A paper describes a structure:
The underlying channels, termed volume-regulated anion channels (VRACs) have variable selectivity and conductance between cells, but are similarly activated by osmotic stimuli and blocked by small molecule anionic inhibitors including DCPIB (4-[(2-Butyl-6,7-dichloro-2-cyclopentyl-2,3-dihydro-1-oxo-1H-inden-5-yl)oxy]butanoic acid). LRRC8A forms a 565 kDa, homohexameric channel with each monomer consisting of (from extracellular to intracellular side) an extracellular cap, four transmembrane spanning helices TM1-4, a linker region, and a LRR domain. Here, we report structures of the homohexameric LRRC8A channel embedded in lipid nanodiscs in the presence and absence of the inhibitor DCPIB determined by cryo-electron microscopy. The N-terminal arginine residue of this helix (R103) projects in towards the conduction axis to form the highly electropositive selectivity filter of the anion-selective channel.
To this end, LRRC8A was solubilized and purified in detergent, exchanged into lipid nanodiscs formed by the membrane scaffold protein MSP1E3D1 and phosphatidylcholine lipids (POPC, 1-palmitoyl-2-oleoyl-sn-glycero-3-phosphocholine), and vitrified in the presence of the LRRC8 inhibitor DCPIB. Focused classifications on the linker region indeed resolved two channel conformations: a constricted class and an expanded class. Masking out the LRRs and applying six-fold (C6) symmetry resulted in the highest resolution reconstructions: 3.21 Å resolution for the constricted and 3.32 Å resolution for the expanded class, respectively. We attribute this bi-lobed density to the DCPIB inhibitor based on size, shape, chemical considerations, and comparison to apo-LRRC8A reconstructions. The density is well fit with the predominantly hydrophobic indane, butyl, and cyclopentyl constituents in the larger lobe extracellular to the R103 ring and the negatively charged butanoic acid group in the smaller lobe adjacent to and below the guanidinium groups of the R103 ring. The structure of DCPIB bound to LRRC8A provides a simple explanation for the mechanism of drug block: DCPIB acts like a cork to plug the mouth of the channel. The R103 ring electrostatically interacts with the DCPIB carboxylic acid while the bulky hydrophobic end of the drug is too large to pass. The upper gap is filled with three well-defined tubular features that are modeled as partial POPC lipid hydrocarbon acyl chains. The presence of these ordered acyl chains seals the upper gap in the channel surface and may act as a ‘glue’ that connects adjacent subunits and stabilizes the upper transmembrane domain against movements in channel linkers and LRRs. The structure of the extracellular cap, DCPIB-bound selectivity filter, and extracellular halves of the TM region are essentially indistinguishable between the two structures (mean Cα r.m.s.d. = 0.42 Å).
Numbering used by the authors:
A (entry chain C), B (entry chain D), C (entry chain E), D (entry chain F), E (entry chain A), F (entry chain B): 15 to 68, 92 to 174, 233 to 408
Amino acid sequence: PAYRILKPWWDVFTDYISIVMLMIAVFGGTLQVTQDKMICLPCKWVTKDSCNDSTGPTGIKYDLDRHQYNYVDAVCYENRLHWFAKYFPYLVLLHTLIFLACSNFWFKFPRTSSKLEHFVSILLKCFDSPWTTRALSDKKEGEQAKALFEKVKKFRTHVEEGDIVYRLYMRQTIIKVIKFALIICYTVYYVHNIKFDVDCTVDIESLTGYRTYRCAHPLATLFKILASFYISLVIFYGLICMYTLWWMLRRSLKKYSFESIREESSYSDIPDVKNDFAFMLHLIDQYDPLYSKRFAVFLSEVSENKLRQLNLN
Amino acid sequence: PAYRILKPWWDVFTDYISIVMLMIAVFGGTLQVTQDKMICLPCKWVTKDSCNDSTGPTGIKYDLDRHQYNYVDAVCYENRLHWFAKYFPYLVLLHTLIFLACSNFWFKFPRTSSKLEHFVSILLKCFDSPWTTRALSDKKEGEQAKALFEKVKKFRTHVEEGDIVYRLYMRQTIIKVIKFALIICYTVYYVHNIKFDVDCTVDIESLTGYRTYRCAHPLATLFKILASFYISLVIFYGLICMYTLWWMLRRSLKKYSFESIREESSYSDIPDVKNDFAFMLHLIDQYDPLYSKRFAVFLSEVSENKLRQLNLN
Amino acid sequence: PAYRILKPWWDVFTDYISIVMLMIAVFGGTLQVTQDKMICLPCKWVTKDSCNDSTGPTGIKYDLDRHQYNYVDAVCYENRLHWFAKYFPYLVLLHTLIFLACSNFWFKFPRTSSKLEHFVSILLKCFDSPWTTRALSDKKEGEQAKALFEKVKKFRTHVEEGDIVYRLYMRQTIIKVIKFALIICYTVYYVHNIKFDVDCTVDIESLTGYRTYRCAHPLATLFKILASFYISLVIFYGLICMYTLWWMLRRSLKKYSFESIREESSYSDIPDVKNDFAFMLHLIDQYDPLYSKRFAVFLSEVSENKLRQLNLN
Amino acid sequence: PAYRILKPWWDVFTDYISIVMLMIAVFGGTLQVTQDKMICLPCKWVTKDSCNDSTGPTGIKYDLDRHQYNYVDAVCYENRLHWFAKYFPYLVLLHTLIFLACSNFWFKFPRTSSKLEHFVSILLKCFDSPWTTRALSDKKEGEQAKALFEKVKKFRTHVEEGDIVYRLYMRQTIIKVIKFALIICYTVYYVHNIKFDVDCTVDIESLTGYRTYRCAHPLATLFKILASFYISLVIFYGLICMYTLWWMLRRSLKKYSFESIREESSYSDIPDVKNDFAFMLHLIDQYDPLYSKRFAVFLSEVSENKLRQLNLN
Amino acid sequence: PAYRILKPWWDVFTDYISIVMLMIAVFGGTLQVTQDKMICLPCKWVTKDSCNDSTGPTGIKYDLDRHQYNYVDAVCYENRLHWFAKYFPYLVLLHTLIFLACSNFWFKFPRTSSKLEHFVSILLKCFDSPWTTRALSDKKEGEQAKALFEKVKKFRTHVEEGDIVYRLYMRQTIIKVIKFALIICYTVYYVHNIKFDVDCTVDIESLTGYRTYRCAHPLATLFKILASFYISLVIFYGLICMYTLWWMLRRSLKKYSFESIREESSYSDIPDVKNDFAFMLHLIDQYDPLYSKRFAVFLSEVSENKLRQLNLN
Amino acid sequence: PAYRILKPWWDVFTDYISIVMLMIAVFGGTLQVTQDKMICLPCKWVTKDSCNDSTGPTGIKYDLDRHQYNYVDAVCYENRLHWFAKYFPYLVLLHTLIFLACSNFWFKFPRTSSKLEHFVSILLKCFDSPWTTRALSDKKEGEQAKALFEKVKKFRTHVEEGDIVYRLYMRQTIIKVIKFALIICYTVYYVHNIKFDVDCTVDIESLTGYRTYRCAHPLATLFKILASFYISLVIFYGLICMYTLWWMLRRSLKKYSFESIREESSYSDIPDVKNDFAFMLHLIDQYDPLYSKRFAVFLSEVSENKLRQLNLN
Ligand SMILES: CCCC[C@@]1(C2CCCC2)Cc2cc(OCCCC(=O)O)c(Cl)c(Cl)c2C1=O
């Protein structure tokens, strides 16, 4: 619908950071399932379960076929390779899906979807009411206008009693910021774990004839870039959601301060909201202060009284 | 159409869990048909039809080509590998298609599609009727309004006699919950069956020269993750549909209790529904209690009588 | 357009069974063209043109390269493999395309497309006529209403003379049911023909040096599942179209029985249809009995006469 | 736009036959570029530049590597394989594109696109004119109606002078039928040319050491099916366009016979068309005879005169 | 938008020739990046840096592995293969993108996009004005009509002063025709350069042991077809744009000749255009002469005067 | 929305150059991940850690298998190949995403998205106001017109106080031009770094037996083309954004010069804008000077006064 109004900048940036994060997850994964192989060779001279590194030169002959080179490639890939190298692209796609859910859960949950759609529906009618132009400074619009005064007066009490919307948005960002804290905790802790050269000692002499091998994961660099890119993409994500958390904890959005628009418009009799109609009003003010300024007229009694006198006369 | 109104939260969560379940089925399957191979080697020293595991080291020579390594890879894949490892991604896609059908069967079946579309069609007109604003607290809308009083009075009897809708939704969830009970029964029972190292004794010495071989299914881990993920995705699915089953068995949705909206609105003469018009009314109340509160006016006689006096005068 | 009205449940189920049938045909085929290979080995000791099956063990050496292993793989695949294993996915896609054509041929053929679009066009206007509400129990709608009385009176004779629509729907299902009878005849007859282990005796000793070989079709199981799934998907298809055939042969849909709606509505002067306007009326009654009940008013003479008196007065 | 009206059944069937023809061309081609390889082996004993076909058995050793097996595979594929086996899928896609162009050229050419769009535009207004209902058996529609009488009288002369439309449709089908005659001429003539077993004598002993080889094209069967399917798909195509050619040569569509609709409607003063407005009128009659019957009223003078008297009085 | 009006036939054919040209570029390229390999063998006996071509036969043994067959395949592919064989599909895609840009640059450039959208906007209103029907042979349309007389009188001077549109279309085709002249110059000159059999003398004896090799580019034929098809597709393109160049150089489109429509309509006082409003008027006349004939009325003074007298009286 | 109005030609060209730049990045990358391999051979005679290059000829035998040819291919690819050859396609996709963000950031940021949507919304109403036709040379449009005079008078002060829009467009191009300066700095500096023949000395004698190898990157040419194409594509990009930077620094767009439209229209009392409403007005003038000329009437006082007298009388 027209839900762009309810997405501040801190949820517009985040909506795109949660796409590029998806692009590397689906790119790293399709690359992984595509090849993600290991090239493993034996080491004739072994010491400490490691390669000892002990006319014209000739090649070395291990006497192995292509099929018992591939066996050891799999064994040394399943056992002696770290889980974070193999399953990383599938892991950051998971976390991406959480971030996409934790921002659209607000809209899809029906107890809050109705209230939001109720709020945007009256605002566009309030925004598109011709009569508000006369008051911010005929008869058909006046009856259309009083029709909107009443439902707004019912909307003023229908939604104001419930406080679910401010809590979801409060319990959506606060877990997103807890989520970003855990990603950076382990991801940086295991990013060093992946590397190109890996040794494996898998204990198969009955099949091949060698105990230790030396492997070479070629995608170790290309993943190390994406993880270093992913962490840097998430830190910018985390600071965004850390700011909106602070904003929701300092400004005290439960109660709205409507004394400024009444200061200059000479409408002393305008009520101040208590809870959960202030917030969504505090939110759309982030978009612009115009949609609330056009709304201050439908919520005053003398403005209704002036319409009533014009409607009486 | 506008059928979002008829989907509670327990069918909104489930609509997305039935997509991620599809994503792993189509991902596990395209991965399966892609490679899903086995690397099988012989064992020179055999005991109990198993590998006995009995200067510088050299490779072992079995004297086999690439084509009779691939033959044994297929035989040991078709016979001595469990059916649940090969056909798992095709199996959870089947179950997914059932869950998608068992929730849209409600909408597509014509005996119930008409009634539902009949219910949403009058509600939006009831919701968008300007006259309801006057009554919840001119002449053209009154005739438009009485036009809606009559069809609602016919709708009150056209649908109320049949009880098919409440039974489909009752026979859709109750088999879905029976379905979730069987998935968890066998899936956990065979998830241990898949594993990386598998031995095979296939009885082909005329072709290769060896009796027993040792194989290595490399995707055994990656599938074990998805199955452990699938089971955990289904248990959250099952508890959802277990709750809506309880809800439909405790609240007694055949009869609706409309005595609350009349308590405060001063409309004593409002009838109570008997069957199959209560339910769909009990359902949209889950979305919000506003669409039914705006509907209580079109179903009362004095509200029609007050319109009639305004229409007479 | 709005042709959902003209599709009963027995053509809604069938519309989806004809998609999953397509999914396995396109899945079996892309899988077939992808690999569909055979791994064929010789047999040194042959008896009856079959494999005779006659310190540490060593591999057997046939002295063949990769290119004369692939030659015999093709020869034993083209000749000594059954045609039903290779061309099955391309065969059930054909049959699927017939089933999709034999149900949309009704709509695309212009001699019948016009009549159907003529029928749905007046019904929605009959359904959306405000005047029908007064009669089922002002002046502008009355002229709009009489405008519809006349074209319906011309539609009553324009279409009633032709009988093409009832014959197409009669000649569409009756060949579909003849089609399902032939599919089950041969498909079950050749489903046993496909199997994993197949022997081939292709008579090429000048090239390889061996007369007989033993092959291994690995997809033999995976196709045997789809065919067993396809047959089970078609039997449910066939019973659907066997029921609608019986329905069209027992109820005698050429003549409609309109004596019920007139029994309670007190409209004795309502005509009974003869052919090809009864059927499409008998069909939409399957959707709901409401679209015909709202239609009984535009087809009566006294209802026109009562409008005429209201139009005269 | 609404150009379904101008497509008879013989151009509705053909519109779908020209899609399945495309499906095999794009399927045969993607299959061709995918593999389309040849497996070629030498023949030690040669006679007439052909394979002479002259304890336990052992494999034959030619002493060749994988890279000089692939060279001969290409040489024997480029030279000693017929051009119709390699380039068939690219050839029937060409012919398909012609058939799609030779039926939409009618619509895209601007000298004829305007006339057709002019014809469908007045017909829907003639079809949707409320006044035609009164005449086939008020004041605003009468002026709307006379507004349409005049442009139709100008349309009667604007298009009738030119004859380009009847010639394009005459020069579109007559070359399509000439095209179908050539396809069947050569396609059947070379369909036998493709086959599985092909010999090649390419004269390269300096590189490999053998003069003659025996090859095996594995796709020879699968293409032989598609060509036998393509020819059978085109013969049904050709008979369609052979019928519409006969129809356009027997009925004499230059002049329309409008004496039937005037016979029963009692409108003696109705003119008969001469050229290129008869045809498009003769065409839409194929769809239904109703759009022309509703059109006979706007083209008569007394019908205009009766409107004029109702407009005068 | 509705810019089909501004595309004559010589830009409708060209719009489709510039798609099939794209289809072979994207087909030749995806085929190229897919395989585009070379099979290269040595020649033991060399003369003039070329292959000298000097009981049962046996294969020749060069003693090379698969990895130093692939090295020479790349060296003889990068150096001793012509640049036109490798980069041809990427080259004709470039030229295609120019042709698509050189025909939509007219529409996207804002100095000319506005004028064109201004011209089509008034024409449809002129075409859809009911009053033009009376004049080509009431009060609300007259004021709507005079509203259009004035903006057309301002449009007559707003656009007529600038001449950018006629120069872009003049400088778009004249470079397209210069472009077609260069394509045919070099493409035919290098099409012979590609061929199947290519020799290479790359000077690597330290690695392989041979000086000269003989290679086999297998796609040389399939590209030779596309280039011969591309050249034949461009010559038909070039003659199209050579004709529209001549048309724009013979007819003198700067000044329009409006004396024909006034000859028969009896409107002597109609002005003749000078520049850049004649052209776009000369262009839409190519579509049909009807849109200009309906336009001659809004541009005459007595037609405005007759409206003025009807507006005065 | 209708944001084509706010994109001059220097942001229309750039919108397409930023697509072809994307096409080579996604083409170079999918090509890279596809193969991007190296063919590496040893050198028996080494000097200076480089290949010394020291009857019938025979092949050279290094005694290496396929698996220790692939190991060295990876080691010599990860270490002794330049980072700019491997990661180039992923690098120019990054820079492309910046250029796409740095031009749509203007539109997506809500503090500026509202102002722009506010500006285009009144302009189309100003453009589509019928009354402007009378003034540039009835009663309902006059009230519709005065309704627009007031909001424009509020829009004249609502947006004029803020200066964010002119700074974003100033801080978007000035960093884009700083970005183009850095691309050309390093890209040309490392484009020579990629090449076909590369030597590697990786210090693995324990595994293979050779110290130095000679490799062959086959894609070195095809990337050198794209980079030379990318640099040439960016230089045309950079000059575009260098011109719009100069334009924004010479014309002094903070203040608009509205004295020309008033010179000829005889409206002396028209105000001159100060900041941030001049710019967006200076911008749409680039599209055409007509949208501002039609706007000069809604911003004058006597034009409102003349409407007021027509509204008073
Ligand atoms: C003559 C020495 C025997 C060893 C092998 C054996 C002899 C026959 C094969 C094994 C190893 C190998 C590996 C090869 O590459 C596999 C690419 C498969 C694909 O295309 O995916 C090729 Cl070509 C060759 Cl000749 C060879 C050999 O010389």
